[PDB]
Amino acid sequence: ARRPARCYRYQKNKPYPKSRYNRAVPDSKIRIYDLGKKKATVDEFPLCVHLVSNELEQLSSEALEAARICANKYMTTVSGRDAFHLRVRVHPFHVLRINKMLSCAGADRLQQGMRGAWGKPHGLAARVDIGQIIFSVRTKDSNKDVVVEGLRRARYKFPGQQKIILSKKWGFTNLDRPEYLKKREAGEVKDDGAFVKFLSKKGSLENNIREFPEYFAA
Amino acid sequence: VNVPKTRKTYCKGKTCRKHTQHKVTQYKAGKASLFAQGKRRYDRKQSGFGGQTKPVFHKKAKTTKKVVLRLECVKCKTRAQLTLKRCKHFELGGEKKQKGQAL
Amino acid sequence: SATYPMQCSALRKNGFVVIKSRPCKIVDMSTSKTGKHGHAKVHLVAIDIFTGKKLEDLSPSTHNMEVPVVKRNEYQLLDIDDGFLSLMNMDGDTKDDVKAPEGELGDSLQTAFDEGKDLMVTIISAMGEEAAISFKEAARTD
Amino acid sequence: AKSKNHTAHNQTRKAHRNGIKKPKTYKYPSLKGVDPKFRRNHKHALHGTAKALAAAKK
Amino acid sequence: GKSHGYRSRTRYMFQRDFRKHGAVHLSTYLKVYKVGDIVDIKANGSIQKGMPHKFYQGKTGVVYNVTKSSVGVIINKMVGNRYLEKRLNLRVEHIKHSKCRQEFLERVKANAAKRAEAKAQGVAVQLKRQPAQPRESRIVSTEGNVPQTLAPVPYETFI
RNA sequence: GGGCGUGUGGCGUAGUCAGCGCGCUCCCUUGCAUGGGAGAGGUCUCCGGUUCGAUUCCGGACUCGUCCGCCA
RNA sequence: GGGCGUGUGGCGUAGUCGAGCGCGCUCCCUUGCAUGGGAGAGGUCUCCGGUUCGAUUCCGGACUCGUCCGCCA
RNA sequence: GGUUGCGGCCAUAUCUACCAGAAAGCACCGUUUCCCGUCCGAUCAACUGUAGUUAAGCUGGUAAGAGCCUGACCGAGUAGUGUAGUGGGUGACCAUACGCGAAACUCAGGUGCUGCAAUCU
RNA sequence: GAAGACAUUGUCAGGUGGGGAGUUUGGCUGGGGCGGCACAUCUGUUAAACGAUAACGCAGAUGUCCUAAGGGGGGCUCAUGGAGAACAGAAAUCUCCAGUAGAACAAAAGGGUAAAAGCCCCCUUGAUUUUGAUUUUCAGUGUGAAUACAAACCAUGAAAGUGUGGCCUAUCGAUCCUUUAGUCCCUCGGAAUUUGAGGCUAGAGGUGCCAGAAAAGUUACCACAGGGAUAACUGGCUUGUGGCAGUCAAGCGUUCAUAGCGACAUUGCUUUUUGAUUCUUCGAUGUCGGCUCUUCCUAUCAUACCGAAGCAGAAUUCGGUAA
RNA sequence: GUGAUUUCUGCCCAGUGCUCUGAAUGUCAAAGUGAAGAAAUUCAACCAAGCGCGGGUAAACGGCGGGAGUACUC
RNA sequence: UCGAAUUUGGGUAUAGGGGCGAAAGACUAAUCGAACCAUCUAGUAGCUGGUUCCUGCCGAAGUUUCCCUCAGGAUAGCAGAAGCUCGUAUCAGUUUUAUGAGGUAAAGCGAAUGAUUAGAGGUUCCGGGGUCGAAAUGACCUUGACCUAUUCUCAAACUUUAAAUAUGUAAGAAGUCCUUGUUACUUAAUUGAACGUGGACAUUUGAAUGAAGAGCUUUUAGUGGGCCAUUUUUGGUAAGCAGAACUGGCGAUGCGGGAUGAACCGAACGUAGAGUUAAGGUGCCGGAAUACACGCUCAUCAGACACCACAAAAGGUGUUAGU
Ligand SMILES: [Zn+2]
């Protein structure tokens, strides 16, 4: 009962989010976005691999769900359920419309054609760009060959072209590997639930000393 | 709406030329006289054979009328008219709105 | 104005219309196409509120019918004498112009006033003629 | 039988055939809309100025 | 149906601005306009009386009438294939003097000063403005400025 | 497929931005006939918004009953 | 052809994952214009798989039944 | 230079937490007969400048302070965009030519200036 | 003989009167009809940073309400949160602190507003008179709405000032006719007085199809002028839907992803389905089905030769060259 | 109007018509009557039929419903 | 069907909104849902068709507003003709300089509004589930809220910021400066406002470029169905679909090229000669190198040129070059 994704592949319309002018959309099919060992610390998983688009198109929420299930299932079967952290870095906010025509014989007796042809919501999609990350996984350096294969299996569920790039960053942060290493040898990083908070030279010295004590322990 | 029965307003009655006290009423049209020229012409045109000779209006659309206040100066008896906006309810009896009291 | 125009399709059930210069209340509405090409015609069955007679009219749907203003007002009885009710308004105004009802409503009201209940009377105004339709009893404020 | 609703095609070409000529400006523009208390005094001022110049170059 | 009211499509045009709402400062009331002044029109949304229409926002005109709290301004409006003359009565909160006119008057007085001082010698005053001429010959030296050779950089991911 | 109406205690329903009557269950009174008073009983179809407050004003959803879906 | 829902003892019918009542008649007691009362029998919860610890109950498939929409000049 | 009265621009002036304030001026402060206003001389009104106090207001200073302001060849000539091609590509879109050119970010600095009149160790 | 000043007859007046006559029976429109109003308007957006800008585009609104919810002045600060106080609790009243508006301003939406444009109090009628000018829509016509003045007469405040309705953007109506107010002025033409009538200036009674006819159907007995500006065939563009084919592989298959299948996803092809559109044809291209007859396509049911199997034989299934 | 014979033709007069020798001020023309006026004229009373009120009529046009309980009953 | 409700001759009666009808709207002289003849009548038509010699010059519109307006008119615009007043300017689909105005593209969300993923630390007179507890405004875990510091992703009807392109004004003689006349306006006041007298400043007189004359008036035709291309853009799965914005075109237009074609590329046209080219080409058709140079590809469906007349996902120790 669902149209093929080629009818909604391209970004032909303006963004159409769920708002107080829509008020009746179907809920998204993808619901879980962070999975694997999502409660892991930052220095547990140094390596990060990205599935990144090469197209300017719309990805369906159904396709996002299918790719998430495929990559998660493959990596938990080959490497264990808590050896990786996968994060879906796109969210379906664009709403797809359909002008539903009757498929009955002699429909033109009651069709009215293209008059008042404004559509009804039937699906949700995420609008991506050139070089935008869809999937991001962080793991140890011993799981590179299985997370590349997991992303390669997940790439079949997506239209268009995607690339698998091994990032130069440490995990889900934005510093490089030696930059993060020379930062964490000092005490100016401090862990959070999954992420890490950093020290800055601004701010009040009392707060900067109750937090982050080992760097000032010089 | 509500309009008070009296009003101090300008009177161009050639002796006042200022604001004097005025008693207000509502304007009534008065009966259409016979021997008005249009009525005589209409009766002459309607006599004989030919049926109805003038249009009769049917497609009524308004539900209200504009109210007209007839102001009457208490000194020199001169009269003025002024119209208001359209209102469904109108009254001249002054029952003033009061604020901090119950429903 | 006393009365205002409306469209036949704009009319619906339990609404007031003017039929043959009488205030009437609709009980039935039915629309049937005149010819396959043509517009539907509205057949209206209504009951006069004052007299209870059944009046029907059919018209084009696009035609405009006259509609009265009906006001229902709430009063307390003071006396029933000579077939004329005497009523008492909020803020203490009193009217005696209402004639007493002549049917089983009037008989029940007469017996209720004879045996001494405090009676709440609903009287309706439409197109310059006045009548009483129903009575209740005040459950509180005895 | 629907038809074309509105367009502005060819309109600037039609305008620029014979140009968008600027309006002709003049010395002594019109005094309409100017304040009447100003104009009522301006009349007497010019009348006195004309009388003084006539008496000077009489 | 369609809607073309007097203040249609004026939402961001008649918003005030960020963090300068409230009452207007007294310089706009202390500024003095004379007949023949050239003024810019920018409406103030805080003042609802004497407002200009949305067409005249950002338009520049000439004062022709001065009244108690307002100013009469003349604008040229393109209607069809010609310009028409439009007279507007605007309160003084919606206008300010055009700075280009006072810049040109400063050029006039400095130009007359130059002509007056150089008339005592006759030194070919050359009072017209000239645009940006092509830059002439020069000698650039390498003393402490030996050239540094640059090359295109190879490609990287940078994510 | 589209449009209209519909849900209130068991029933009839009425209504201002939940009332009675007849049902039910007790009690009391007096026939010829009775009548009265108490109670238990209603998320006003449902869910939101608006509003001091919504049966009432609006939107969305459900159920049921209707009326159209024609010319070739 | 497609869609939607349905399936309980001989019959009707109640089922929140932890098969009851009524009707038919088995027996006994009880008696005109033939009753009542008391103990009875009676299900593979349409069937087949999985989940659970155990599915009438949850899910998937099949069968069956009942509704709704559908050819041309 | 401090303070007061009236200001202009309206945070470089605001906010948070502390510290300091000679002189003068403001201020808190004392009083209810009169004018006046309140449930309440708390606010407002009036009287005294006396009985007192810098505790507060106010002013200034401090803070790897929040905010705000300025600058940078900091990001970045990046994103975007006007013009051009019988350019590439199935397409989606993308390079090049002649031009214009951001915002976030990062870093550095700053934290009221001033007009008129009066008055002050 | 009967009847008799009654019938009859004549002229007016009321009723009845499709038996008959004359006429009418909106427009837009992805054909028309039904539906809706995109027909007079308003807010935000589409709208592409001056202005303008369409669709039966999207989200909504108007035919009202208000003697205060208008005008002037004075005092005060709101939503909310925290901490307290008998009954008193989630919500009654009182007290303090924080509080850039997160409240309120009649309504739809968007702007605007903090010693206020909000809440409370005091006084009032400028929601008045006389005609001009200007802005929007625009032909620079009308109507509606609005802006700034002039000449009066007022309100309010100590005053500066402010006020010609509603904080701003919507909230509405020609000619003819009737009627009211003013001037108590002009005319009734042989001359006067008084009624009556007609004029001048300013309003009201209304046309919502809102620049403004007085208006029910049917026609399969039908007619005329036209139209491919416009529907019902084929053909053409498209392929949602229909049909057919792939890729990936969680699983089914005792065990085993792929012998045979194959979920969640996703890429296509075809024009033997039905839609969508209106390009051609309305001075006509004979629109069901069947019978008859020829040829073409392959996405192969059988026959020929083969490959694979959860192919022992028999039977069967999958696939290839093949029309 | 129905359409030989045979056998039957049930219920309903609310509506639309049709029809009364009923009862009689509600609607109520012209002429006529009265009042006011100087008259044109204005205002009232009175006011025929028909409407309106009250009956009849279906071999007149026509019409022939729902909710409960146990076909039946309410 | 054929002895009668039979068939039929002649005479006679009924005539057009009339006749006659065992009823079909049948028949009424090949005419009937109102006969025929003549006249009114050359009835009206916003509708279809046609509209008669040559050459020269200029040369459109399918757009604004109103209309029972939507196949039509009026009005404005576009066009022609007649000119008139002057003689290089009170010009300009252009740039520069100076100065405004805007809220789109972009960006932002550890900035307001709204949406939204994940943990962390806290708050329980201040939650809910379990377990331990006599119970406890008890305890221990867990899960929900609220707060604090973070984190991932977004907005046509969100925004602090904010382009590019378009867009207003100014760049003097109708100017600047000095002095002092008028007034019933205005000021406490010759204070100011406006218009003036007299005097000074001239070709670099106030940026560039170009001017082909500049300005003005009257009158009237046709038109008021448009369509296509690039870019921006709306509805739609899409369309040789429907609807907008700026420009250029076709219509109205031939010529060279795209084999062919309204719109594409090049270029716009008096009659000829010579030369050079544009776009496109140079094996032969076919005018012009079977030129030169470096590589790649062998297809048992090769490929061969924009608009344009199609092909994708997924694969291949085919072959080549790379990381
Ligand atoms: Zn007077």
Cα E158 to ligand 1 centre (Å): 91
**CA B75 to CA B16: how far, in whole Å?**
8
Which of B68, B93, B102 shows the shortest CA–CA distance to B3? B93
Copy the structure tokens of residue E140.
Answer: 């650039």
Which of E47, E61, E52, E129 shows the shortest CA–CA distance to E93? E47
- Is any atom of strand G within 7 angstroms of residue A104's beta carbon? yes
Distances from the Cα of E105 to the Cαs of A199, B45, E99, E138, in angstroms? 57, 78, 10, 37
Residue E77 Rama label (left phi>0; alpha psi -120 to 50; beta): beta
Which of E97, E107, E106, E119 shows the shortest CA–CA distance to E38? E97
On whether the CB atoms of residues E93 and E28 are closer than 8 A, the answer is yes
On whether the CB atoms of residues A134 and A158 are closer than 8 A, the answer is yes
> Backbone phi, then psi, for A151, in 5-degree steps?
-65, -35
Per-residue three-class SS string for chain E:
CCCCCCCCCCCCCCCCCCCCCCCCCCHHHHCCCCCCCEEEECCCCCCCCCCCCHHHCCCEEEEEEECCCEEEEEEEEEECCEEEEEEEEEEHHHEEECHHHHHHHHHHHHHHHHHHHHCCCCCCCCCCCCCCCCCCCCCCCCCCCCCCCCCCCCCCCCC
**CA A151 to CA A62: how far, in whole Å?**
17
Copy the structure tokens of residue A4.
Answer: 């093929």
DSSP structural state of residue D6: -
Torsion of CA A142, A146, A149, A154, to 10 degrees: -120
**CA A215 to CA A197: how far, in whole Å?**
13
To the nearest whole angstrom, how far is the Cα of A146 from the nearest Cα of chain E?
A: 21
β-bridge partners, C74:
C122
Q: Which of residues 54-73 of E touch D (CB under 8 A)?
A: 64-67, 72
**CA D5 to CA A34: how far, in whole Å?**
53
**CA E51 to CA E47: how far, in whole Å?**
7
Residue A212 Rama label (left phi>0; alpha psi -120 to 50; beta): left
- Chain G footprint positions (protein CB, under 7 Å): 69-72
- Is any atom of strand F within 7 angstroms of residue C12's beta carbon? yes
CA E91 to chain centre: 20
On whether the CB atoms of residues C95 and C89 are closer than 8 A, the answer is yes
In chain C, which residues have their Cβ closer than 8 Å to the Cβ of B64? 1
Query: What 3-state class would DSSP assign to B3?
Result: coil
List b or e across C59-91, with b for residues whose CB sees 16 or more CB atoms inside 10 angstroms: eebeebbebbeeeeeebebeebeeeebbbeeee
In chain E, which residues have their Cβ closer than 8 Å to the Cβ of D39? none
N- to C-terminal Cα separation, chain A: 67
Q: Which nucleotide is nearest to A33 (CA to C1')?
A: K117
Copy the structure tokens of residue E125.
Answer: 């005053």
Instruction: Round to a whole number and report the distance in Å from the CA of C21 to the C1' of I16.
Output: 22
Long-range own/partner contacts, residues A212-215 (CB < 8 A, 24 or more apart): A212/A187, A212/A188, A213/A187, A214/A186, A214/A187, A215/A186, A215/A187, A215/A188
In chain A, which residues have their Cβ closer than 8 Å to the Cβ of E155? none
Query: What 3-state class would DSSP assign to C32?
Result: strand
Q: Kindly identify which residue of chain E lies nearest to residue A131, measuring between CA atoms.
A: E159
DSSP structural state of residue C51: T
Copy the structure tokens of residue E53.
Answer: 């229409």
Q: Kindly identify which residue of chain E lies nearest to residue D25, measuring between CA atoms.
A: E85
**CA A88 to CA A139: how far, in whole Å?**
15
Residues of B with CB under 8 A from a CB of C: 58-61, 63-65
Instruction: Round to a whole number and report the distance in Å from the CA of D3 to the C1' of I129.
Output: 54
**CA E35 to CA E65: how far, in whole Å?**
6
Which of B25, B43, B35 shows the shortest CA–CA distance to B79? B25
Contacts of A43 (CB under 8 A, 6+ apart): A170, A171, A184
